[PDB]
């Protein structure tokens, strides 16, 4: 059995568009998030990372999924808690590491996203909740995965 490290992932999903961030320093679009820190709830860590990485604040988030990632050659699992919100305060801000961009929901840039997103982001769009697991060789190749719609995350 492996140890896991906690991470967050936040999708700013509006009725016609989604906000993603491009990793600059790279080339992949993703939600916003990072490692949960000592002492904070997972939801508060998600809000903190959204603000640190995009400039956006939100009063609250909705938890929509949990995904565990395993990478060949890495002993630690990434336990990613996935949140959405439709309600935002301020404008997204580009940094040296991340460039935010809105995409229309008929132009979701799946080929330039993590490959797993093609499987779970459709569920998120349908207001479904999910649990997933994906094993990767490097950045591009999935060797094994499981995905399940759930009623409670
Ligand atoms: N396969 C995958 N699919 C996906 O959609 N998001 C993934 C993913 N693998 C990792 N992520 C997300 C999870 C989390 O939001 C982020 C990884 O966290 P980071 O290493 O960026 O955390 P930190 O911001 O704490 O790190 P530093 O900025 O290096 O301190 O990438
Ligand atoms: Na971060
Ligand atoms: Na961080
Ligand atoms: Na991050």
From Swiss-Prot:
Pfam families referenced in this protein's UniProt entry, alphabetically: NUDIX
Mutagenesis / variant outcome for changing residue 116 to A/N: Loss of 2-oxo-dATPase activity, reduces 8-oxo-dGTPase activity
GO molecular function, one term: 2-hydroxy-ATP hydrolase activity
EC number: 3.6.1.56, 3.6.1.-
Effect in UniProt of substituting residue 39 to I: Reduces activity by 60%
Cofactor(s) needed: Mg(2+)
Enzyme class: hydrolase
Binding site for 2-oxo-dATP: 8, 30, 32-35, 114-117
Result after altering residue 151 to A: Enhances 2-oxo-dATPase and 8-oxo-dGTPase activities and increases thermolability
Mutation effect (residue 53 to A): Loss of ability to prevent DNA damage. Expected to cause loss of enzyme activity
The gene coding this protein: NUDT1
Gene3D superfamilies: Nucleoside Triphosphate Pyrophosphohydrolase (3.90.79.10)
Subunit architecture: Monomer.
Cofactor-binding details, from the entry: Binds 2 Mg(2+) ion per subunit.
Outcome of mutating residue 33 to R: Reduces activity by 97%
Protein name: Oxidized purine nucleoside triphosphate hydrolase
Domain of life assignment: Eukaryota
CDD domains: NUDIX_MTH1_Nudt1
Documented effect of changing residue 150 to A: Reduces 2-oxo-dATPase and 8-oxo-dGTPase activities and increases thermolability
Effect the entry attributes to changing residue 50 to P: Loss of activity
Variant or mutagenesis effect after changing residue 153 to A: Slightly reduces 2-oxo-dATPase and 8-oxo-dGTPase activities and increases thermolability
Reaction(s) catalysed by this chain's protein: 2-oxo-dATP + H2O = 2-oxo-dAMP + diphosphate + H(+); 2-oxo-ATP + H2O = 2-oxo-AMP + diphosphate + H(+); 8-oxo-dGTP + H2O = 8-oxo-dGMP + diphosphate + H(+); 8-oxo-dATP + H2O = 8-oxo-dAMP + diphosphate + H(+)
UniProt: N(6)-methyl-AMP binding residues: 8, 23, 114-117
């Amino acid at each position: 059995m492996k140890a896991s490290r906690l991470y967050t992932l936040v999708l700013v999903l509006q009725p016609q568009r989604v906000l993603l961030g491009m990793k600059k320093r790279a080339g992949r679009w993703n939600g916003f998030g990072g490692k949960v820190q000592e002492g904070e709830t997972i939801e508060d860590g998600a809000r903190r990372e959204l603000q640190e990485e995009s400039g956006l604040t939100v009063d609250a988030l909705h938890k929509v999924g949990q995904i565990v990632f395993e990478f060949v050659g890495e002993p630690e699992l990434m336990d990613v808690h996935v949140f959405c919100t439709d309600s935002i305060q301020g404008t997204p801000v580009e940094s040296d590491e991340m460039r935010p961009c809105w995409f229309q929901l008929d132009q979701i840039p799946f080929k330039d996203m993590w490959p797993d997103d093609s499987y779970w982001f459709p569920l998120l769009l349908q207001k479904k909740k999910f649990h997933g697991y994906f094993k990767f060789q490097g950045q591009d190749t999935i060797l094994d995965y499981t995905l399940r719609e759930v009623d409670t995350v």
